[PDB]
Symmetry: C2
Subunit: 64 residues, 2 copies
């Protein structure tokens, strides 16, 4: 199976992991530009905010 | 300007946003070397997995 910790794994693995958490259609590229990092690092930040918004909303909505 | 759906903002802004989402006192420069992205793009991915596990744990507790 996989390793016991996520310790210093390469850029291809952490890119595939955040894209798999968002259910991608086999995305990513070898581009490495300022635009490539901005798109990836905005996408992971957007997914944090999506889960926090949903968590905060459902905790009061299901309480009835 | 539009009142919703921020996109294509500079790398310093999205990096200060993911750092303060993880509880830092704001942020600074977004960097651009391979060592910078292997840190910040993994930290933001760890915060997705954290909040998914938190949301899942309270959902299965309050379905009763």
């Amino acid at each position: 199976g996989p390793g016991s910790y996520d310790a210093a794994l390469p850029i291809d693995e952490l890119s595939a992991l955040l894209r798999q958490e968002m259910g991608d259609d086999g995305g990513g590229s070898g581009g490495g530009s300022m635009q490539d990092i901005q798109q990836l690092l905005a996408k992971s930040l957007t997914e944090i905010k999506r889960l926090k918004a949903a968590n905060q909303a459902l905790e009061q909505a299901r309480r009835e």
